[PDB]
Subunit: 460 residues, 4 copies
């Protein structure tokens, strides 16, 4: 078996030990393996997967395989692979092209190695994506391959937005499931995942005390809510920026001060618009938005000396790292930790006090500087992924006539009943006990004893 | 002016001082007053109002009046009136029939005094309701009056459920707005309101230390989430019961142990089904469900000696108080606090150790034993109420032809843009500063610089 | 029985119900009753008591009586009496002179009614004091009475400081126990008591939302630590002022921003020295210091409009209320809540926006606007008081010859073994289980299996 | 330069980058460098140092050198060295013998390499110790060397206990400072250090979700307080065991359930004494005691399957790791992480469900599986160490006449004034501003404007 590329295949036994532990942490995912092992619902599925090559993702991959699928895998970030996970999957005879610390050129080559087998399109018929890079490459460069693909299952808020843009422009060629918007994904992974893994990544990157220091979190969606709590539970003084006044209201009610980097919140792109007094007090800024340039050049100039700067939104353009590459000297402390010397770009003084610490070169900090979300959280997301792969593979869109395709070309979520069944496996993994409604109680609130327990309008 | 009934009209000056302070705590509601005072959009509105006669409700009433409405008011709970609020509204020449500590017969008489003026149906044309008792009385006993009514605006989860049952059965006679499901209502009031006011009510009722004691919260919807945090922030050891596995998963991830009062979560109606070990360690039980008999006779028998029992869901049947009235002696400590002696019903021993403390006779404990949610939280709910009253009054359903009525008979929410404009007023009241998107950023995430910022699918 | 003065004797039955509940919350105190009831160790003790006439203090009083003592009682604050507690103690035939809302003249008359019986010195032989007012009156005005007094047991940090000043000046006439510095007092009452009761008092006084608002706590000793947590757990953004850099370090490490009301912390008494930017953002200031003028005239001028101002340190000169009485109009909202109109002193405008809300006229806010600490916390303090009364009464200082007195005239704390025995009763009241050391473990750490478990140097 | 032993000297540049960052995190320590660089108060000091060879310890070593000292260094734990710190110190030409993952034999050899230079006792005259192993070796094996030594400065609770046993037995040969009991050490390092670093080490070791899981912390001293908060802030359900009822009372008041591993807290050496129900629900046990066998063989047998076991007290005998080495198969997952298979010792099944995860082989888990306390916390401890070294070096005990030695042979703490001056540097490092007392205020509370602010009795 040679159909892989990883950092170091000799890490495989360590990765396999960590997979066996992670299995014990992922009861929804292991439950789907046990339930569906017999029926082989993914027999004949040939899945192109592009998602962080972590231990949790290894458990996802081997669940899809255990259900009958063949896969070809890559990471969706240059710094998110755990090399022992990649090695364990390769050593199992699964095609994987992933290592921690890829270049952009290697990143694109890895996705290509999944799309091509022996220099020709692989007989792919399904896609699992996180962020939409593989989706975009198939649409732009491999339209013939999408002809035979039954669907896309998309992990993340950013990737869903890209799908919806394609659907609205009439350029989306195969149906998708939005896995992100299962409640056991969005309100589990995006929020509690970041709670666990943000302070984990800052500690591993910097070993800084957080207690007593000043943080600014840009955004208060699911990731900004979890991120703010990661920091506040360590004793940080957390301020929150938002453009959405409903998310801002939540921040205030959750006990955070809501501030703008700009005077009166007006971002007109002059230095004069920067609240230099506010930024000069900030010890840590974290971007969580999915948006562009929310920690901009003028904010970076105004930040407190030796502030930590990081991004936990899907892509690195949240922080103006291009400005920092053009203007300032980068001193590497260790992989995914750089001092950015604001003294200029012509070398640096090792003892200069005027620097920022940038984590993971502005890419997803939880996965770049630590191991991302813990397996027990990723269990929810990845149980959704498997159910989404089963649904779209069984629907066989590629085999439908033109007229039938027209009726099914959509971006849909999983039904609430499945969301509830994932949650129940998650709760039992904590040793939680869910109460059964009596028939009188079920009638009184207008639900089945079996669920679903909430209308699709319910926000949790 | 004699067209009222309150406990003590001499409390009016105290209530008016508290209204003036509450005005300074309610910028969304005061904002609507200032914005709409000139246009008088409720000129000709005649509003039957049935909602807790508190200081916050006073500010809501005087906002509707300031916008041109006439009203006739009652409380929707026997114990929720603040007598100084009721006095200040009566002393202003507004018809209100409300006092703290009504009987059921007085409660029904008060609603009837709103419906009748000088012994004849009032020319009502709008309804503001909280829990649906006034809605049900108009439908069952005054159907002729609903001919003239343009709409119902409903405050609470329980009242919405009752409207949706009427809609589904074809018995709803006028269109309604579900005020509850604005995010600035549900995810503000139902959650953060209970955070503030649950521990407040237990302290005022009992003066008990909560720190270090064991709580069981039944339910983990918006109210159970807020309630659990009310108790956990005081240092209670909180366990959470749920029938909805997605809500249970949230509980676990929020750091609570999820338990059932019943062995394996199966309540088959036997004492054998009760987890006597669990209930024997509980110092406080709080019901939050909107369901029936979630703290049942067998649970009450198994509770630890001197446990506190209370309900913060809309109606008192969450706790089996009928069982306690039939079997056990009630010793009143002070209004809305009773020792329930489990020794039997034939008098009580003042020194008996075997009692439970029931708050507010099992009625909404935050309003019964304290003052309910703080005005700054009720600002969101009541700004939505005013917008909903303006919308349904302006739509003039009662004046539509038969064909037009058919098309408009619905239970609807307010548009997200209005929800965001309420939130922004709330955020400014904290001195929060919301960031303005740049045109490039607004294009990048696919929103208008003015919002709305989120799809209607978004759960916050 | 007529040897009392209380607000309303008809409140006695309500107070007695609350005493019987409080007994169930005070296992250390009830434990001392049961242990010592037989031995009557306070037979012949005649105790002048001056401490907040609350329900917890009623349980203390009836414990001293149950051990054989006679008492004559007053409160140590004009607003701290619970009238139902005072009535229950009077109705039991115990001399008590206390009501909520005394004048200064009534306060002094009440202490005098304890000292005098039938217009002559009572045959007092013990003193229980909280703050040192009764101690000072006996020393200044009744030296002949101290001749026959065996000791003083002093509750609070301020009262101990006054005793130590007397000891150092050679003016202290009888030995004292410092009850404050039992760990089951200082690190229980002073800290956790304020955690429970500060936000309780602000809620009862104002019903304000705290979540999302800005607080400044002056001081970070035991009371400032508890006070800061009371506010932070509600979601306040808490800043902390301190003069003690070790207490300030704790604040920083506990996740608070440490600020001064003065520029660079320099209090030179010009308006120019005030950080107007900081004070203009503060929604609540709480003084916790035991010191004078820590919320001074220039700070009060600079505070944000409609800020709440309160004191939870023993005496009201922490806030410059004398400046506010001289310069600004007071509008009473309700007892122990005043709007202080900064527009001037010549009446007020009911609708003026420029006011502060002062709680309890600057006197102890937890007891003034709520019920002070919960009984389960006061159990520790009051178990210490009883043990201290037993010790000094049994030592019989007044009967010692001059030479023997000289050897015993001291301010001492209780032995650690007693501190541990109080704690153990407190832990069992939570249903806590303390582990017993094995003989090998006891030898390994160098302690008896029975304790004491820590050297007297240990700070906990 | 060859007078060292480290893992890999090529790590020196990485370690030096991390020293330069740590300098910016350690203002008390860098303050002492700048203040004392000119006076060279450790000119002629020859310091045997035995303390964790971390980045923070590097900054301590180079401060002592900058003040004039020569040193010879080793770690006080086999797993606590950061190899890049050891390399950076060796590359600076400082003798250090330390690497992560020493054997016991290498550990003893490393201490001996400090004691011997070129095979002969080094002319040592000062000792800096953490845990007392170097102190004990000099007393037992090199008594002649203690003739020349002016003092010992001891870091930790365990090492202080050992010194006090030596003092009491008349076997202590040189005076010592108890650095541990500075407030800026004990109530900073021992508590907040473990808050930061316990969850850090469990995350790096296991990547386990902590939220929603059950923890048992044995002990609630400074380390158990910090440890319990490390876990509770992550959303663990934390139970606390204690033998000291005052520490247990704190636990209850801090919102933790106090339990014993043994029925009624009595461990009589039988499996029957184990609370199997309690231990069967525990997902993580952490020992914090400084005592022996507090997580014993019977507890380990009764623990839930796949529970994590770790020790954050100084020495590994807190957990019965000898029982586990004698009875159960150890599967190494990665360095300092072992699955302990309870199926027996004759190999293991890679897929066995019945295992515990032991971190750092039961050695100090924060240093073994992460990087120990953050530099900003260690700043307090290490500023005290430097002041203690200056004081004992300047007192020159070894040069005193016999009579003078007699009078100075003691275990003492640093004066409070120095403790306050360390704290103030720490507070300024957060950008905290300490308020200056006015002369009137300083007189009112009876302190100097300069401090000290508290009596030596004060516990903070
Ligand atoms: N690192 C991870 O493990 C992880 C986990 C899940 C999601 N993600 C990524 O995180 C990003 C956010 O995802 P989400 O689910 O929280 O999305 P979301 O839509 O729930 O939240 C994003 C928030 O950012 C706010 N925002 C936008 N522009 C802003 C600006 N200029 N200033 C301040 N606030 C601004 C929006 O109002 C919104 O509330 C996405 O890119 C998503 O793919 C990362
Ligand atoms: N007191 C107040 O101030 C206040 C505020 C808002 C709403 N309410 C009332 O509170 C109630 C709940 O409102 P909400 O918005 O939280 O509703 P919700 O639907 O958000 O939450 C109710 C929860 O109860 C759970 N539940 C139902 N039966 C249960 C059972 N037998 N055991 C355990 N859990 C069970 C459901 O699964 C659900 O998650 C309603 O009656 C509502 O009108 C009161
Ligand atoms: N209300 C209650 O129930 C309650 C409870 C116990 C004690 N008390 C009273 O509270 C007060 C404080 O008691 P404590 O035990 O916390 O005392 P403490 O000595 O532990 O704390 C007082 C703190 O105030 C600080 N301080 C002094 N002047 C200051 C200034 N100008 N600015 C900022 N900080 C300043 C000191 O440095 C000290 O840390 C006393 O008067 C005590 O009798 C009240
Ligand atoms: N890992 C680190 O970074 C770090 C930091 C500081 C100290 N330490 C070490 O941690 C240990 C504890 O230090 P500390 O300052 O907290 O000491 P401490 O004396 O403050 O606390 C130890 C606690 O353990 C309790 N205890 C003893 N035997 C017990 C038993 N059988 N069951 C339950 N509780 C029991 C004691 O009552 C005491 O409260 C020492 O070995 C110390 O040197 C480690
Ligand atoms: N990063 C670290 N560097 C050095 N010593 C540390 C570190 N973290 C914890 N310690 C010390 O470990 C000691 C226990 O041996 C504690 O007293 C503490 O001071």
């Amino acid at each position: 078996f040679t159909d892989y590329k990883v950092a170091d295949i000799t890490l495989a036994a360590w990765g396999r030990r960590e997979l066996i532990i992670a299995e014990s942490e992922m009861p929804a995912l292991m439950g789907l393996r046990r339930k569906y092992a017999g029926q082989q619902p993914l027999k004949g599925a040939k899945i192109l997967g592009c998602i962080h090559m972590t231990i949790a993702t290894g458990v996802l991959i081997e669940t899809l395989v255990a259900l009958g699928a063949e896969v070809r895998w890559s990471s969706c970030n240059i710094f998110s692979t755990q090399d022992q996970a990649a090695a364990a999957i390769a050593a199992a005879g699964i095609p994987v092209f992933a290592w921690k610390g890829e270049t952009e050129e290697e990143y694109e080559w890895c996705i290509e190695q999944t799309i091509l087998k022996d220099g020709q399109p692989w007989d792919a018929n399904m896609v699992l994506d996180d962020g939409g890079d593989l989706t975009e490459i198939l649409h732009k460069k491999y339209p013939q391959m999408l002809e035979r693909i039954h669907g896309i299952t998309e992990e993340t808020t950013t990737g869903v937005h890209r799908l919806l843009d394609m659907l609205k422009n009439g350029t989306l060629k195969v149906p998708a499931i939005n896995v992100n918007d299962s409640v056991t994904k969005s309100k589990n992974d995006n929020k509690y995942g970041c709670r666990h893994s943000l302070n984990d990544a800052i500690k591993r990157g910097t070993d800084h005390l957080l207690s007593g220091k000043q943080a600014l979190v840009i955004g208060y969606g699911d990731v900004g809510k979890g991120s703010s709590q990661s920091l506040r539970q360590e004793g940080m003084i957390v301020k929150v920026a938002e453009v959405d006044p409903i998310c801002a209201m939540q921040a205030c009610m959750d006990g955070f001060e809501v501030v703008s980097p700009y005077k009166n919140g007006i971002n007109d792109g002059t230095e004069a618009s920067i609240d230099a007094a506010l930024l000069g007090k900030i010890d840590l800024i974290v971007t969580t938005t999915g948006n562009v340039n929310v920690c901009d050049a003028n904010m970076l100039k105004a930040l407190k000396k030796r502030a930590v700067v990081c991004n936990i939104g899907h892509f690195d353009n949240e922080i103006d790292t291009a400005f920092m590459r053009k203007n300032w000297a980068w001193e590497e402390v260790k992989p995914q930790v750089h001092k950015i010397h604001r003294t200029g770009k012509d070398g640096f003084d090792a003892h200069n006090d005027d620097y920022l610490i940038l984590l993971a070169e502005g890419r997803l900090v939880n996965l770049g500087n630590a191991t991302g979300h813990p397996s027990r959280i990723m269990d929810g997301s990845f149980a959704n992924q498997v159910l989404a792969q089963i649904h779209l593979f069984e629907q066989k869109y590629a085999d439908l006539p033109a007229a039938e395709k027209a009726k099914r070309l959509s971006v849909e979520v999983l039904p609430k009943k499945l969301d509830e069944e994932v949650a129940l496996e998650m709760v039992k993994g904590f040793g939680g006990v869910v109460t059964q409604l009596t028939p009188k109680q079920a009638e009184y609130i207008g639900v089945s004893v079996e669920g679903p327990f909430k209308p699709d309008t319910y926000r949790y």
